[PDB]
A paper describes a structure:
[name] from the marine pennate diatom [name] ([name]) plays a key role in sustaining growth in iron-limited ocean environments. Typically formed from 24 subunits arranged as a symmetric, hollow sphere, ferritins take up soluble Fe2+ and catalyze its oxidation, with the resulting Fe3+ being stored as an oxy-hydroxide mineral in its central cavity. The di-iron catalytic ferroxidase center of [name] (sites A and B) has a nearby third iron site (site C) in an arrangement typically observed in prokaryotic ferritins. Here we demonstrate that Glu-44, a site C ligand, and Glu-130, a residue that bridges iron bound at sites B and C, limit the rate of post-oxidation reorganization of iron coordination and the rate at which Fe3+ exits the ferroxidase center for storage within the mineral core.
Three crystal structures were obtained from [name] [name] crystals soaked for 5 min ([name] Fe (5 min)), 45 min ([name] Fe (45 min)), and overnight ([name] Fe (o.n.)) in an aerobic Fe2+ solution. Iron was observed bound at sites A and B with near full occupancy, whereas site C was empty. These iron ions were modeled at 25–35% occupancy and occupy distinct sites from those observed in wild type [name]. In [name] Fe (o.n.), an additional iron ion was modeled within some of the B-channels. The iron ion is close to the inner surface, coordinated by Glu-35, weakly coordinated by Asp-30, and coordinated by up to two solvent molecules, and modeled with occupancies of 25–35%. Glu-35 adopts two conformations, one coordinating to the iron ion and one pointing away from the channel. The [name] Fe (o.n.) structure provides evidence that these channels can accommodate iron, coordinated toward the cavity end of the channel by Glu-35, Asp-30, and up to two water molecules. Interestingly, iron ions at the B-channels were not observed in the wild type protein or in any of the other variants, suggesting that binding of iron in the B-channels is enhanced in the [name] variant. However, structural data suggest that there is no change of iron location, as Fe-A and Fe-B are fully occupied in [name] [name] following overnight iron soak.
Residue numbers in the entry:
A (entry chain H), D (entry chain F), F (entry chain B): 1 to 159
B (entry chain A), C (entry chain E): 1 to 158
E (entry chain C): 2 to 158
The structure:
């Protein structure tokens, strides 16, 4: 189960990578005066960190060694020029979180590690809800930004 | 020094000038049926007057003589044509409030006037917040006013 | 009527002028350690500004164009040398406020402007109350100040 | 740093010295039946002690060595004959507290000691207020004492 | 601009410190020091909040922020007792303090009164933090002179 | 009686001296990270100052003229090297406060000063309690310090 222990360790890196990418989106939104979208992103940055800390806590309890890796620099911000660019990157980010969790669950399954598979269940369900929510926001964003100025009313109203 | 006392007095005039220019903006907004923006400007007129009163109160305590100057007539209101023009003038007003506080702080720093520097700290931080907030409103106004009527939404909501 | 529009604008100037004169007074009092009288002047400074704002609000609703004028530098504080002098100048200030209101009401009457006359009624009555209160304070200040120190012992009616 | 550490110690001394001088003034007032002015001085004695204690606490946290110095016998009370003499000595005392703080800040500024400067900020503003208040009381006392017996009104009604 | 660079660097420093505290909580947990682990975990949260505060002020003040990589913590590999961990944490807070002071010096040279004012509560916070960490290190060092006695500090937390 | 006046004044000096010495103990404890013992000594510093204030207040009422003397610099902290040293010095301090109260009572008894004797009664009983309590803590400190680290473990708990 060297694969399982390694992937578990890497899941913590992935969640924290996502936290930093959300924070990067917050920053872009704030610098561009989308304070409502920036607040959503900031909240999600905290939530991803909490997912990471969940993995760490479970690993400690289950004697899965955790070695904390570099958290990479977010790079998508270099290329964002509209809110749609940001939300699309966040959709991609959540799809990558989901795939990383399914890979982990597959190694757990192969190992017959019932405890890990149980631990992961609510995370699988959470990612379903998160991808749906982000996809829905992206669809709204994309539609509203067909008329100049209109997407500014999503920011002020929702968020 | 002379410079320090002169600048402290002029800060009072600056806050009260800002108060009057905010009042002028509320009037333009009101006459043009932007009651939301008018109410915000009116609230800011009151706030700038409280900043001036703050400086007057400190000056009295610290024995800095205050002589109240004329508060000039607001000038920008004659040439405003849209809410974007108002908001841009208000941003510039806040930037001038900020520069004036920084010049005051400089003069206090030169005199080693630690009490004045301490008194000014929250005003420096308030200005950061105010410039950010006004700059953000201005960006929103500029963006929404690209579609006829849409800005009239900002007003009625927020 | 040009006369009624002009006078309505002048009333705003007069209220704000009064606001600054009261502030000047609070300053004189505070610098001379009359903290109770200073607080009273500060409160009256706020109240005059509220009158001005009420005029501006009504003008906006009634489509009377307001152009904000310079608010002049208070000058009586160069001559004040006792509390009596300050209160006397405050009395004369309120008498001028009352006169400008009466002149406005006169123009409104001439024009048969019933709404303006109704709007002014509470201000006419308020001026009765204010001239009465300030007059009574002045008489008390004048009487107490006939014994050294005695006036001080009643600013501590803070 | 020699001078900064010396001045920081001396500040504790100055606050406790002021505490003692205010106590002396409470004594003089009490003995002369100014119980209101006496209670005020006694409150100020406690307040100055609190300032000194705040300096001691900060010094402990910041590893600034404190050695407590003698608190000298107050000597102004030997010469006070009227309430006016006492309040003038108390004004001068506060003026000396203020000067001492400004000297300490100057030494902190020279050392680029940003933490000490920040700690001092509320003390700088407190001194403005105290000098103002003591200054105002002195003017009232000097005015009211121009009529025999009138100053006993300040004591009883106020205070 | 040395000031803009140093302001960016402060965000990185705080997040670095967040990770290092997380690494400490891990070492403590794995070695059954649950009380000390809880403390480090709370301090990890706190460092991240400091970093967030600098990002927020920078956004308001138009100081461009670009998030850097958060380096992996390195000290855990060599910790062998609680004393080692708390020593590393004291050092970490000393570095936090030094970086804040460097930032304040750059701000001072630029006459940037707003940045200097914003940093004031952080300078005071560092004083309290280095004091508290110092004091814990001292207790830990003392109590660990008797086999098993340090487990008492933990369980009374 | 000049002796009674002199002893009454010396009592004030002794209480204030005790206040400073307790403060010095708070500082040595704080510097050496004994925060609990430091808090205790700080509280006792305030209590001693209150005793002094109670003596000043009684003296003013009874027309016993008080002249504040110098409060000497505490010097025992230069030689304290363990908590036992500090607590031993505090026991000796309380024993000196008791002796000065007994000397004052003796002088009041000689003068048949019934009011001063009555005034002193609560302080005589308070000293019994204080010497008992300090003696008991000193015993505990002395015993616990026989095992490396054990004393620390109880600063943390007690106090
Ligand atoms: Fe923002
Ligand atoms: Fe959650
Ligand atoms: Fe996640
Ligand atoms: Fe997620
Ligand atoms: Fe309207
Ligand atoms: Fe302002
Ligand atoms: Fe402003
Ligand atoms: Fe005042
Ligand atoms: Fe009103
Ligand atoms: Fe009026
Ligand atoms: Fe009036
Ligand atoms: Fe008495
Ligand atoms: Fe206090
Ligand atoms: Fe206080
Ligand atoms: Fe003080
Ligand atoms: Fe003081
Ligand atoms: Fe555990
Ligand atoms: Fe930090
Ligand atoms: Fe920290
Ligand atoms: Fe401590
Ligand atoms: Fe007590
Ligand atoms: Fe007691
Ligand atoms: Fe005692
Ligand atoms: Fe005692």
């Amino acid at each position: 189960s060297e694969e399982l222990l390694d992937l578990f360790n890497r899941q913590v890196t992935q969640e924290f990578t996502a936290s930093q990418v959300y924070l990067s989106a917050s920053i872009w939104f704030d610098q561009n005066d989308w304070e409502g979208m920036a607040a959503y992103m900031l909240a999600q940055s905290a939530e991803e960190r909490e997912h990471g800390l969940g993995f760490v806590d479970f690993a400690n309890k289950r004697n899965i060694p955790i070695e904390l890796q570099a958290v990479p620099a977010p790079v998508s911000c270099a290329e964002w020029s509209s809110p749609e660019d940001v939300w699309q990157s966040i959709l991609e980010l959540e799809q990558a979180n989901t795939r990383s969790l399914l890979n982990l669950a597959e190694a757990a399954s192969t190992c017959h590690d019932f405890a890990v598979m149980a631990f992961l269940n609510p995370f699988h369900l959470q990612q379903v809800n998160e991808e749906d929510k982000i996809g829905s926001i992206l669809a709204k964003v994309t539609d509203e930004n067909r008329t100049p100025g209109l997407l500014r009313s999503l920011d002020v109203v929702s968020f």
